[PDB]
Design an enzyme around this catalytic site. Sequence first.
Site, PDB file in Angstrom:
ATOM      1  N   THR H   1       0.748  -1.009   0.082  1.00 30.76           N
ATOM      2  CA  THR H   1       0.141  -0.177   0.226  1.00 30.76           C
ATOM      3  C   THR H   1       0.251   1.651  -0.156  1.00 30.76           C
ATOM      4  O   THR H   1       1.950   1.616   0.676  1.00 30.76           O
ATOM      5  CB  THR H   1      -1.024   0.124   1.007  1.00 30.76           C
ATOM      6  OG1 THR H   1      -1.955  -0.795   0.863  1.00 30.76           O
ATOM      7  CG2 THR H   1      -1.894   1.853   1.186  1.00 30.76           C
ATOM      8  N   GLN H   2       0.850   2.121  -1.644  1.00 31.62           N
ATOM      9  CA  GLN H   2       1.335   3.826  -0.918  1.00 31.62           C
ATOM     10  C   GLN H   2       0.119   4.319  -1.245  1.00 31.62           C
ATOM     11  O   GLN H   2      -0.464   4.321  -1.791  1.00 31.62           O
ATOM     12  CB  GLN H   2       2.319   3.319  -1.741  1.00 31.62           C
ATOM     13  CG  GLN H   2       3.219   1.634  -2.246  1.00 31.62           C
ATOM     14  CD  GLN H   2       2.264   1.406  -3.554  1.00 31.62           C
ATOM     15  OE1 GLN H   2       0.687   0.722  -3.683  1.00 31.62           O
ATOM     16  NE2 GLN H   2       2.352   1.480  -4.980  1.00 31.62           N
TER      17      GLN H   2
END
Lengths: 226, 196, 196, 195, 195, 222, 212, 233, 204
Positions: H1-2
């Site tokens: 996740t970014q």
Amino acid sequence: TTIVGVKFNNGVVIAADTRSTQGPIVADKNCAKLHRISPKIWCAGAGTAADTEAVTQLIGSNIELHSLYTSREPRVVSALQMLKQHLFKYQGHIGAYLIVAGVDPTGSHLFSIHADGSTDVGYYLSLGSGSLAAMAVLESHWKQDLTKEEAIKLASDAIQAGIWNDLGSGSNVDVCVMEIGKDAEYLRNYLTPNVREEKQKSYKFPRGTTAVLKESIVNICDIQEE
Amino acid sequence: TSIMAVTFKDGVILGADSRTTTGAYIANRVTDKLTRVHDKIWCCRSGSAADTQAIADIVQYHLELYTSQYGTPSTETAASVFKELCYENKDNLTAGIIVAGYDDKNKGEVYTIPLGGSVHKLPYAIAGSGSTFIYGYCDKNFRENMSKEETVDFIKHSLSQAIKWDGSSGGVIRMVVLTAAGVERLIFYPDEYEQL
Amino acid sequence: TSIMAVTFKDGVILGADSRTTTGAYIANRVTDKLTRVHDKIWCCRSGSAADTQAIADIVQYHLELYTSQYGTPSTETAASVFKELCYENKDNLTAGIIVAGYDDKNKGEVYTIPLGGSVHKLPYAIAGSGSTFIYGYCDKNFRENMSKEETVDFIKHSLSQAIKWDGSSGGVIRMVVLTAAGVERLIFYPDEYEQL
Amino acid sequence: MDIILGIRVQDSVILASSKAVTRGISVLKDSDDKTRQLSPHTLMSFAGEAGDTVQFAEYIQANIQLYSIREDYELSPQAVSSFVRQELAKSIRSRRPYQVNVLIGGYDKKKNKPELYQIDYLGTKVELPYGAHGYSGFYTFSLLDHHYRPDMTTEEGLDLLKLCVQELEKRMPMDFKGVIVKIVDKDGIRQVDDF
Amino acid sequence: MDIILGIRVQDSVILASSKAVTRGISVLKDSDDKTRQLSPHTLMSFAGEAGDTVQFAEYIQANIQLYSIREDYELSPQAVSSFVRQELAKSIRSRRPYQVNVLIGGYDKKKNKPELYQIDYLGTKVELPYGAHGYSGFYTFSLLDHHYRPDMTTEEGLDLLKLCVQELEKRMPMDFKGVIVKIVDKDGIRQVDDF
Amino acid sequence: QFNPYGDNGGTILGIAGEDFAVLAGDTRNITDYSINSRYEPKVFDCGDNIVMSANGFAADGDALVKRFKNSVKWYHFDHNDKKLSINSAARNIQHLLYGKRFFPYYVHTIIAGLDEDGKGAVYSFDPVGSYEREQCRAGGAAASLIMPFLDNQVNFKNQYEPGTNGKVKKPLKYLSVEEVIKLVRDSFTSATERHIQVGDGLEILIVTKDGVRKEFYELKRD
Amino acid sequence: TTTLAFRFQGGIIVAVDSRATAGNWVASQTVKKVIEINPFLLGTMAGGAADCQFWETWLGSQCRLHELREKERISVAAASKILSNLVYQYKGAGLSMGTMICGYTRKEGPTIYYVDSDGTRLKGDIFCVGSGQTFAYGVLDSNYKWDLSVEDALYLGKRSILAAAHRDAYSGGSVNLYHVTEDGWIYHGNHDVGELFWKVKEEEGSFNNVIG
Amino acid sequence: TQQPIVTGTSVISMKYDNGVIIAADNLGSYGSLLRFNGVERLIPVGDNTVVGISGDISDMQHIERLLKDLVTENAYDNPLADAEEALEPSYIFEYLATVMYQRRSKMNPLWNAIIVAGVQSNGDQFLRYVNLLGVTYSSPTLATGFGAHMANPLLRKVVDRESDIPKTTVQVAEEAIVNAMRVLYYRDARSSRNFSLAIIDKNTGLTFKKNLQVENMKWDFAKDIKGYGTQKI
Amino acid sequence: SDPSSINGGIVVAMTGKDCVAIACDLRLGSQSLGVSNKFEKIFHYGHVFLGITGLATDVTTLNEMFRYKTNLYKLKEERAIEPETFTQLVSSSLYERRFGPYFVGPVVAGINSKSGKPFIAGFDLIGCIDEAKDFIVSGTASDQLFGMCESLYEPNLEPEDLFETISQALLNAADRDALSGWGAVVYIIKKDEVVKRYLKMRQD
Ligand SMILES: [Mg+2]
Ligand SMILES: [Mg+2]
Ligand SMILES: [Mg+2]
């Protein structure tokens, strides 16, 4: 919802689709989103349906009383100002997004108004979930010096973009035309491009199909003589 | 928003872009952010459109009533009325307003009213999201007592850069000229200012 | 941080302020943000000091080992090694780095690597918190193929403005000149650049 | 307060209400009467938030006693239950609402019928042959659905109740310290002092 | 699982453990034996999180039965209780720790002494004349502090326990459906089948 | 925060005939209030006379269908081109779904075909692999608009014989394929009127002992 | 959901409802909540449908392997414990199970173990599990005898599910009945609650509250 | 996740009678800062495929390198590399779709929405979409992000179903695409004036137009607009 | 916890030839627990009929309120309120509680006594009017009711045909909702007789 407003030569036209939804469900297939504020000031509403109806009638009522008090035909800038100051006071919680248009002694006018009470001026506008589909059409076909026929066409073309491309909009196109020196013509169901096709089967039941425990005549009449 | 107001030898000029935004969607690409509260006292609006419109409408009402009772208000007086509204309602407003006017005794004046409702009298002022990108440029290119044309150029070039870098800003560049000679509206379209 | 790198006729110049900050406290007012990863490939560091130092140290190691095996690396190669580190570790880094170098075939080159770890080859680049305030100025005043002195002036004036408006930036202006003639370090103190 | 039950038989209404009062960790009392006589032929049991239960019950009791004096007349159970519903429906949109559930058991001397009304804190009213509040119905309704008859005697009602309370004592985690049982019929309100 | 008690008298250790098993809203069982024989002269009662209690108890039981076979010899209660403490202390820093509290009651045949060990899920061990886990001690410790003597007979211990259980039945909100009592002495482990 | 799931809408329907089976689904693919495609097929021929639809999150739906088709391919390699029976297919799909019990395929799967006696068969699955054999099953967005209709018009629920007043049920007579297609079309036409995510097109795959046939019908595009 | 199982003179009765809901929406009324582990063993389905289905047919496989290796029927004690030990490995991961593992062997007699996704394994005589459990318990607790005839026991189980189906919004559809003997389980049919309710009301004189 | 940092806005596309058109502007945004102005977001693979990418630019650059590396790999021990065994659009798309779905399944997505446009061996038009979730779909018109809301409705007026494709010429289609790009420039605050456009035709091959500009804009009416309601001057 | 689905229940109304029909189930529950099988949700004020689904305390309260208002209306106007007028009164009354609403889904049905026109309308909890030619649905099984009505309904049904249609639409919708059922009533309304029929249905 998709709503638009388009100015032309000698007046202004507004249009709207006729779908109202509860989440993904269509509650009403033929909804009336075109509201009369006074005989020659109409506004199209998107957002919370009760809010658009309620705020339109309150201001409509007060406009009528104002018109009677001043012995003058009501102006659009009065409806605009009354609507915006009411909506602003409620800091967006009254979910009414309106395109306000009409003709009056001053000329022809077209405004829109967000639920928080911010307003704008233009020759062509759109609001609601279908506003981007509509605006794409308006930005593609709008020009200066539209005739009445050209504007009706552009307006309903923009509502069609919304009907076909936006799941929040559908069914029919309503139109209202406000031309200087003439009666406003409200054109309910100006277009009907979505009639349901004939069903494959009739679902009319044989009588007696349904199991019944009791019957009784319900007395709707008042208390009786003699 | 990119807005600014600049005092010069003959008075003051206000300038603004024309973009109104709801997220990434441009709700209005031809907005008029230069608003009139008196014949020769105008303001530039940035922040919430609802808030800045409501404020300007109230200020216009106060200055109309002021005029009826005491004659023409000073630009300082107009700025004070704005400040009172912005300061006392700081918790419920998002409004950054530049007030600009022309007196005959005081000539051109500019007052900026940032978010907290403080007042700052300046030779020129810049505000809105787009202003951040032209602090360097404007500080290097502003001098006092410019001519009308030099000032028009300064604002045109400045807001051109602000528009170039700020996605929130864009559209046409509107300007309003305030001098003894009256009130002049100006407009500059993309093809003129972009290539600058 | 205010950092930039500018290509010109004879190569490239890197420039930076000297302020390191922990909140409002200036932890270091004479920081060296211009860091060497090869004889004539340097970088400007912005973001976390820990992250950018660790990255530069690793890049210097890779390019030293590269050199031993394959001879002098290109500026493009150096930028790619930086990118690999910044891109693959995007979730744990706060680093905005400008890479600048001088080849003899390719002359001066500038690559900017923003937060996400993308790479962008540009004629000049600006970065750090202070850069926002000079987008307008730098865009209006940069031309290609400036002389050494014009380029030194451009950077001095640009970072002067960035420092003037950004409280995070300040101190001295450091520059590093990269040409065929070698490597020149420059320094400019407050009393010189503030009055510009 | 936990379990409250009601059952309407041929000629009377029977209310059974738990005796325990618990302050978190300890049982403070094992003989608590969770009931108020509203009029000579109307009884109301209650359960809900501490303090509010009795405050509400006594408030209603005072209002009905006041009415009785003013008109020299006893309100019908239906009338009393409507007054009570309105007061709770009033309260649910208050600043601080009464968290109280009630059963109203009355004998209507005009119609010569026993009547049982179930009303929750929202002011949700329902006339029933038998009823409960909270978790009580979950254990007992399957027995009442089985054994209940409209023409039961008062003693047949008590036996069905005895069975209901035994199921509760078997399967409920909480020790509610038994029930006080009260009967409402044409002669008024009396307490069964052994259960 | 709720209440578990232990008392060490002259020549034996007595463990009492509640019989109820509750799955939230209903009492699923009223005859549950919350105990495992670890060796002929060592008994362990347990209480804590569902599933983990029995899983832990049986795991310990298997390990001690394994030891008994390998050495042809019975570990002392002290030794067993130390093994058990270590296993819980091991578990408390695990990925998913055993939420189990135990009392270990054994008769040491070498020293001819009864011994009672209290160990919580953290691996906190303590040798005691009497002990409990959870809320049980809050109600019962004031009685045991009063009546306990090191030279009590097994029947005097049972009478003191009878009193402890009565206080619990009076003041505890939960119906724990009585206790199973087991005695650990020089002749091994037996169950008092009436309480 | 990254959300690995989405909702592509869609509605599907499977009915088991006496010696046939249908698996229908609309061809509209949506995200939120936008239409991605008016014709994106959703019901697939999987070989061995089995048809399958995995409705909900299309990325997960596609992955599952791909893996099942692949499961059929390897069943042939490993068991000497033996035909995969519908009950065997159903059990296999349970293991495909439950294999991701703690990061599920966000889909409601339905398969259709013939059982080993040549009788019509439909199987329905929840996202983590519990499955039932069924006669009649709709899934997806407009499932709730369709099933009560089918209860009434297929199984004749709540319909009694006129004259008997509730004592004698309307008897459960057997439906032809043309009769079933009528009910499917009326189901989706009604659903199209009242659900914004249903529309554009209706594609039906029919399974008989002679193989797999396709029929397509337009739906309202608003 | 309502599921029960009880021990008696004649073996074990198992009775379940048939409803499955997604919120208010009734997804199916034809769910088979009795898992036929093998011809001698039954398991009930409450909590997670997939968890119960998947792991109880898996259990059937482990039971088959046991009697291939040991040349002897698996005990209910051992079979239940394979399932409980399996789910206990998954504790914390989010399995959802409340089940009764039911069988009748030579060494044990008729035996029911309540097995549970947070690790509980309980031997008992009467178990009810699901949103309707309290209703079923009431009927069971007041009519249960060890000496019930196979015919009356079958009815008591059917009548208890009926009680729950009536009051509990999340139980209904039909009742499924099973009798478990030492020689295996015997299926005793699907009984629509709609028709069953009216039949029982008439024949028994119960549910006077309801107009029919 | 970014979270995406440097981003690209809409990619728009449609089928016409002999091929496909695809277009995307040359901007790399950094929030509301229009940071990078010379960014090519159409990447040709061979001479029968163009991959248009929106979303995170660092991830775009990664995909760009996967595609270059894919061409290299396909050539290895392949004497028919520039003939029968050249990379098809359908091969290139399926590979990307595989990667995107795998990356979302490891909870580490490539934060993009991708459209693959091209012409197959047999002259059939290929047009398919895939995004950070591994969601895929085909339609006569396709657009990402903002374009899905404003471009699609305009392009659908030209090609509204499959039967409309034979009726649509490359001139009409290009006109529609170019007009859509103007609209997106009027209305999307993260769009730029500069864009690239690529046609993949089954007869004329791949035409790739760089450095296009939005022109014929209507702004004149702006001068007649005053205040926000009542203001006259 | 969601007030509109604590108690459960449904209402449907339809138009036919010179008649209207309005129907409702009889369930009242506290979530999973069924509490009453005799909680009728259709009320009438003169010849105007009002069905109300939703939170039961508000259902009761609103009936009591509209009885109050239609009684005073009659005394002052010297005539019974018409369906069109009542619809406006319902809308007005609900919107007056805009920011603390009654959690209900009302449905109006009746024949205008002057014109003879049959009339139905539906409202959201906040007063919005849905005036449909064909049918109106409300309650926890409204999706199911939309499904049934949309295929079962045809215009200009005769009273005793309309009865079968509305009954079947209600029954089968209720049987796919956990929180509806436990009985049902159908009102068939003509200009000068109203027939009320209780239906036999499954009790789970
Ligand atoms: Mg500084
Ligand atoms: Mg639409
Ligand atoms: Mg039920």
